[PDB]
Design a protein around this ligand. Sequence first.
Ligand SMILES: *[C@@H]1O[C@H](CO)[C@@H](O[C@@H]2O[C@H](CO)[C@@H](O[C@@H]3O[C@H](CO[C@H]4O[C@H](CO[C@H]5O[C@H](CO)[C@@H](O)[C@H](O)[C@@H]5O[C@H]5O[C@H](CO)[C@@H](O)[C@H](O)[C@@H]5O)[C@@H](O)[C@H](O[C@H]5O[C@H](CO)[C@@H](O)[C@H](O)[C@@H]5O)[C@@H]4O)[C@@H](O)[C@H](O[C@H]4O[C@H](CO)[C@@H](O)[C@H](O)[C@@H]4O[C@H]4O[C@H](CO)[C@@H](O)[C@H](O)[C@@H]4O[C@H]4O[C@H](CO)[C@@H](O)[C@H](O)[C@@H]4O)[C@@H]3O)[C@H](O)[C@H]2NC(C)=O)[C@H](O)[C@H]1NC(C)=O
Ligand SMILES: *[C@@H]1O[C@H](CO)[C@@H](O[C@@H]2O[C@H](CO)[C@@H](O[C@@H]3O[C@H](CO[C@H]4O[C@H](CO)[C@@H](O)[C@H](O[C@H]5O[C@H](CO)[C@@H](O)[C@H](O)[C@@H]5O)[C@@H]4O)[C@@H](O)[C@H](O[C@H]4O[C@H](CO)[C@@H](O)[C@H](O)[C@@H]4O[C@H]4O[C@H](CO)[C@@H](O)[C@H](O)[C@@H]4O[C@H]4O[C@H](CO)[C@@H](O)[C@H](O)[C@@H]4O)[C@@H]3O)[C@H](O)[C@H]2NC(C)=O)[C@H](O)[C@H]1NC(C)=O
Ligand SMILES: *[C@@H]1O[C@H](CO)[C@@H](O[C@@H]2O[C@H](CO)[C@@H](O[C@@H]3O[C@H](CO)[C@@H](O)[C@H](O[C@H]4O[C@H](CO)[C@@H](O)[C@H](O)[C@@H]4O[C@H]4O[C@H](CO)[C@@H](O)[C@H](O)[C@@H]4O[C@H]4O[C@H](CO)[C@@H](O)[C@H](O)[C@@H]4O)[C@@H]3O)[C@H](O)[C@H]2NC(C)=O)[C@H](O)[C@H]1NC(C)=O
Ligand SMILES: OC[C@H]1O[C@@H](OC[C@H]2O[C@@H](O[C@H]3[C@H](O)[C@@H](O)[C@@H](O)O[C@@H]3CO)[C@H](O)[C@@H](O)[C@H]2O)[C@H](O)[C@@H](O)[C@H]1O
Ligand code: NAG
Ligand code: NAG
Ligand code: NAG
Ligand code: NAG
Ligand code: NAG
Ligand code: NAG
Ligand code: CL
Length: 968
Amino acid sequence: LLQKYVTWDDKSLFINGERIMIFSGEFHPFRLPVKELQLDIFQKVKALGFNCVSFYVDWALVEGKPGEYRADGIFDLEPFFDAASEAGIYLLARPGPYINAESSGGGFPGWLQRVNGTLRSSDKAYLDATDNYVSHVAATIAKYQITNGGPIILYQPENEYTSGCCGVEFPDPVYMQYVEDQARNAGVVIPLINNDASASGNNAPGTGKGAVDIYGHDSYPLGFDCANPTVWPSGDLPTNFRTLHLEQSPTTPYAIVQFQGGSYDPWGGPGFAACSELLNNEFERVFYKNDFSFQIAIMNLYMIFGGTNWGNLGYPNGYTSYDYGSAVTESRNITREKYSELKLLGNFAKVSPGYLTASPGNLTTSGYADTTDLTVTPLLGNSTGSFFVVRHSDYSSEESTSYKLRLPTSAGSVTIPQLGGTLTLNGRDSKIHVTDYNVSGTNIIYSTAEVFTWKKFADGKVLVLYGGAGEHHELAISTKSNVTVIEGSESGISSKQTSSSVVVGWDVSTTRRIIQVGDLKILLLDRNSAYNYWVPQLATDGTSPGFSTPEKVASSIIVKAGYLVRTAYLKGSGLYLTADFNATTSVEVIGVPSTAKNLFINGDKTSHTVDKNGIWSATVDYNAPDISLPSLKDLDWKYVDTLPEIQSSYDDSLWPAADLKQTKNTLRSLTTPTSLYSSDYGFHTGYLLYRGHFTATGNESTFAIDTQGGSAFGSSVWLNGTYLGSWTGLYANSDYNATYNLPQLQAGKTYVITVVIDNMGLEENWTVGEDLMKTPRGILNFLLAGRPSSAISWKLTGNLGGEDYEDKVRGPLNEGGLYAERQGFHQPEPPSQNWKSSSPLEGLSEAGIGFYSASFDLDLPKGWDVPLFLNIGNSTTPSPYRVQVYVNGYQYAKYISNIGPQTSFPVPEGILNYRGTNWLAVTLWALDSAGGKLESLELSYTTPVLTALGEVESVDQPKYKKRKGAYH
Ligand SMILES: *[C@@H]1O[C@H](CO)[C@@H](O[C@@H]2O[C@H](CO)[C@@H](O[C@@H]3O[C@H](CO[C@H]4O[C@H](CO[C@H]5O[C@H](CO)[C@@H](O)[C@H](O)[C@@H]5O[C@H]5O[C@H](CO)[C@@H](O)[C@H](O)[C@@H]5O)[C@@H](O)[C@H](O[C@H]5O[C@H](CO)[C@@H](O)[C@H](O)[C@@H]5O)[C@@H]4O)[C@@H](O)[C@H](O[C@H]4O[C@H](CO)[C@@H](O)[C@H](O)[C@@H]4O[C@H]4O[C@H](CO)[C@@H](O)[C@H](O)[C@@H]4O[C@H]4O[C@H](CO)[C@@H](O)[C@H](O)[C@@H]4O)[C@@H]3O)[C@H](O)[C@H]2NC(C)=O)[C@H](O)[C@H]1NC(C)=O
Ligand SMILES: *[C@@H]1O[C@H](CO)[C@@H](O[C@@H]2O[C@H](CO)[C@@H](O[C@@H]3O[C@H](CO[C@H]4O[C@H](CO)[C@@H](O)[C@H](O[C@H]5O[C@H](CO)[C@@H](O)[C@H](O)[C@@H]5O)[C@@H]4O)[C@@H](O)[C@H](O[C@H]4O[C@H](CO)[C@@H](O)[C@H](O)[C@@H]4O[C@H]4O[C@H](CO)[C@@H](O)[C@H](O)[C@@H]4O[C@H]4O[C@H](CO)[C@@H](O)[C@H](O)[C@@H]4O)[C@@H]3O)[C@H](O)[C@H]2NC(C)=O)[C@H](O)[C@H]1NC(C)=O
Ligand SMILES: *[C@@H]1O[C@H](CO)[C@@H](O[C@@H]2O[C@H](CO)[C@@H](O[C@@H]3O[C@H](CO)[C@@H](O)[C@H](O[C@H]4O[C@H](CO)[C@@H](O)[C@H](O)[C@@H]4O[C@H]4O[C@H](CO)[C@@H](O)[C@H](O)[C@@H]4O[C@H]4O[C@H](CO)[C@@H](O)[C@H](O)[C@@H]4O)[C@@H]3O)[C@H](O)[C@H]2NC(C)=O)[C@H](O)[C@H]1NC(C)=O
Ligand SMILES: OC[C@H]1O[C@@H](OC[C@H]2O[C@@H](O[C@H]3[C@H](O)[C@@H](O)[C@@H](O)O[C@@H]3CO)[C@H](O)[C@@H](O)[C@H]2O)[C@H](O)[C@@H](O)[C@H]1O
Ligand SMILES: *[C@@H]1O[C@H](CO)[C@@H](O)[C@H](O)[C@H]1NC(C)=O
Ligand SMILES: *[C@@H]1O[C@H](CO)[C@@H](O)[C@H](O)[C@H]1NC(C)=O
Ligand SMILES: *[C@@H]1O[C@H](CO)[C@@H](O)[C@H](O)[C@H]1NC(C)=O
Ligand SMILES: *[C@@H]1O[C@H](CO)[C@@H](O)[C@H](O)[C@H]1NC(C)=O
Ligand SMILES: *[C@@H]1O[C@H](CO)[C@@H](O)[C@H](O)[C@H]1NC(C)=O
Ligand SMILES: *[C@@H]1O[C@H](CO)[C@@H](O)[C@H](O)[C@H]1NC(C)=O
Ligand SMILES: [Cl-]
């Protein structure tokens, strides 16, 4: 429409005039703010066979102060985009402004609680608030479009603009058109795509004003019940998605912009390990192959890598981890079987252009397979090849089912297997069988075994096929040549030659076979062996793989290795692999160019041997050095009391007065004399403190108070130094009505009620019109019994300066309102030289909040990727306490003893300095009158990986400096 690089028709996108199946993964830059680790993820996605990444930008992190857009240092998108280019990954840009994303505010900054208008509407007040963010983010995105030689190919305005309520005329075409025009005005010319929350046709092509270019929708068919990871409920596998597609947007390629790749987990939930069990390899092979049955042309997995909700960036229902049970773990590892299984499907799609041109039919329980226990969805092509998606009709069935097929081919319709026996489908599995499959001029008449990849080399063609354990398979090839077994046993392989073909039956074995048929070699593998193969692009013009274009796709080699193969390139007589190893690994290379004499692995010349089939073999030795980690309990811990407010000497004259008579919040009108909503005063994040001054009459009995912090929040209350009590919190409570009994008060004396409240993050805004992101934080109601409420005069604080936030490097959400945070003592080199020596393992003996500081050195070896974790013990039922941990000033753990479930907090290299000094700052809030303490505090590691990654540069870690605007 507006450019010629990215076009489309009814079947697929075209990139530079060439069809492409977009297989993508969701990855949020703000959840992993270390540039070199961003490259790591990109390279791990490219190794799946993927060609694209989808990303959100969080507005709340980059416009914390209204009118000051800051996307610099750790929030800079440019290194993220350059890393995408370098890895060979296209991008789908999704800057919002609304992103949902289990993020604070759904991406909206807290100052939107002061906007006089419906959020996500055509109300001028809301739209004007978005203009500065969008003109900055979209101009940056504009500079990195594919039209300007960048990686960005698609843009998403808004997010799941799908349900409205409460007097909003949904869907508002004036709204979606304005949001679209914003992007275009900033120079975005690539196609716009939407992500309808269900397949409802909203803003599709043909709907007039506010229509996007490509209609997309999202789908989370297996749901979020991570507690029952083996239960696949009846009818939850979608079957009508093609039917809906043809009703809703038949002129554009079929697109699912967020397809389930994991699950969220709330405070108190079963944990993300459970989520990875639900959204595991079996889920992938059934549910993703099912999306291929609808001829999906654009497919993005939410999430491929989740990362971490550091510095309070997350929404109140979620905790620090955003692992998400995704194929790449929060600590960046790719050990989960779901990664390897996904690699098999992504590589198949990468080399199968006939998939895009075929004609999809409706699913059938007869015609193709000889039992109604199986479903077969055909995608039939007129000589470009066909594809048959086989699964159990009862999609959850764990039964083993025998069958035969009738499939139409160019050489007649054939009953398979021709040479005796039956095919098998074992439980929760799905197969993509193929017919007339083009391997660079060689025609595979059919194969029941699934294609992993194929390549044309100088010295012939190679095809890689796999099946699961215990299965019999059959293939047939258009040829005059004979079949011979060139590796492995002749036994178990049957064959038959006709005038224009050869048929070959084989049983799956753990031992690889290789057959040869003319100029085609075919690898016959079990699934588990196929897990260890990789298909990196072979660069000849440099070291980078480049994008997945037809040329560079064809110029790829096949590599059997272990943990990871990142890249390959040819330079003179050297073949250079870059790869990662988590054990001693046999490396085979198939397709070595004839000019290559030597093998290099991560720069090191490695001795190799060529076998009788031309395969290079070499071993890479794995010998991890000593990984020596400090004992955290034995550090020189320094303590300062971070609730000096409850001392009677405390002077709060510099605090903001909570004296606004009228709230700017349109969702909830005031039920107190003045606004005690934190966001009215610029305070959107971390712990909030309120101080209520009053003069006692001497008749005061009780103080009741309604505090609100979001799900799982806690609050504590003191009268001068007298602890009154705490709401210890529950996931079920986002507010709580407390009643406290006061001690006997002295008439005419002044007293101060100090209230500490955990702000868990701002709410999302999923339904347009409900304005739920405006749900306030702080004090909603109070009652000093027998006194008017104007008796109490309130002050409050959140993070120092509120929207004029101090720490421009670490962002507007990172720190909260505690004394130690306000002064900046959570940063490297605090002024702790005259503080008391005490450990958080000794802790507190009364209700209160302690702040603990210590440094520790690491000297971990270069060329090793070693995942590190902070561990807080919970071996027995604890007293109620809350902990934050800052690592060189960055908050990387929020811990609630009594709710959980997280005890293990990964912290990435770049935040941690692996060859240098590191600073821990721990806040310990004891919500109990006897105090509280940590049971244990430990640094640990998991399997070191011999890595190809370059030096991870430490992010900016500004040291402590006295802050002029502090309250002391
Ligand atoms: C270095 O990096 C590597 C990555 O490159 C990394 O390797 C990967 O490690 C992960 C673990 O982190 C692996 O994932 C697990 O795999 C388990 C094993 O099963 C898989 O493999 C077998 C094949 O096993 C043989 O071969 C291998 C390889 O040669 C050997 O190592 C084995 O020892 C074994 O050898 C025997 O057999 C050979 C021939 O077959 C013989 O030659 C040999 O002599 C031996 O006799 C396959 O059979 C499995 O397939 C079957 O099962 C799967 C999954 O159920 C089905 O989908 C499939 O259709 C088949 O039926 C399978 O591929 C898995 O058991 C394990 O699965 C569990 O965990 C995940 C969650 O992570 C769940 O999704 C899943 O549901 C399973 O959950 C159970 O277990 C968890 C506890 O962990 C419970 O929470 C849960 O409730 C559940 O328990 C219940 O069910 C169990 C049955 O499943 C039951 O036993 C329990 O008692 C209970 O009832 C998981 O997927 C991954 O495969 C590796 N990847 C690769 C490429 O190798 C390596 O570890 C790294 N190294 C280090 C040090 O870090
Ligand atoms: C890939 O990336 C992943 C994400 O980054 C990463 O996964 C995370 O890994 C960390 C570290 O391993 C996990 O934290 C640990 O979890 C342990 C508890 O979970 C286990 O318990 C269940 C019941 O047995 C298992 O079923 C469960 O399996 C599930 O989870 C797996 C997740 O990978 C999955 O593969 C499985 O399929 C399945 O779904 C799980 O294995 C927990 O025990 C552990 O705490 C101990 O270790 C810490 C140090 O690392 C200590 O600080 C801590 O105090 C604990 O040590 C104590 O207890 C041990 C067991 O008794 C003893 O061996 C220790 O000596 C020590 O003992 C002292 O304390 C005892 C009190 O209990 C006392 O009795 C003793 O006397 C003594 O005083 C830790 O929290 C984290 O949960 C994972 N996160 C996610 C999201 O999964 C994965 O590792 C990465 N992989 C690679 C290869 O890199
Ligand atoms: C240290 O170790 C200790 C000791 O073992 C750990 O303490 C345990 O921690 C558990 C987790 O916090 C805690 O269990 C919880 O107890 C509460 C009741 O007090 C209960 O509400 C919890 O169950 C719900 O919530 C979780 C998520 O937090 C869900 O996964 C679960 O399915 C339940 O969800 C239901 O309620 C939610 C609340 O709104 C709903 O959002 C959700 O949709 C669902 O609703 C259904 O039920 C409602 C009625 O409940 C109904 O109205 C609605 O219509 C739906 O039907 C969970 O059981 C243990 O109590 C606690 N044990 C002890 C002895 O103290 C501690 O966590 C550890 N610490 C760390 C850091 O690991
Ligand atoms: O990361 C969470 C993810 O949630 C997305 O909400 C998605 C979607 O969920 C549907 O619910 C599933 C349900 O869990 C299944 O049990 C079964 O019923 O299928 C349903 C889908 O039809 C909701 O019903 C649907 O409204 C929608 O909420 C969120 O949209 C996404 O941004 C992301 O946050
Ligand atoms: C919002 O706008 C209306 C428009 O009539 C105005 O009268 C009022 O001052 C504003 N209200 C709030 C709560 O901000
Ligand atoms: C396939 O599509 C529809 C919807 O599933 C089905 O009713 C019909 O029988 C099939 N189409 C034709 C032309 O037979
Ligand atoms: C098979 O692939 C070759 C390119 O290697 C192409 O020229 C040819 O047209 C293809 N044949 C079919 C039938 O698609
Ligand atoms: C309570 O605290 C305030 C200052 O926080 C102090 O001025 C006042 O004297 C204290 N009241 C009593 C009774 O000690
Ligand atoms: C406060 O005064 C009331 C009567 O007005 C009396 O009932 C109560 O006991 C008094 N003292 C308290 C609450 O300490
Ligand atoms: C607390 O009381 C307020 C005011 O009556 C009410 O709106 C709210 O529902 C109550 N909250 C809880 C958690 O019971
Ligand atoms: Cl201060």
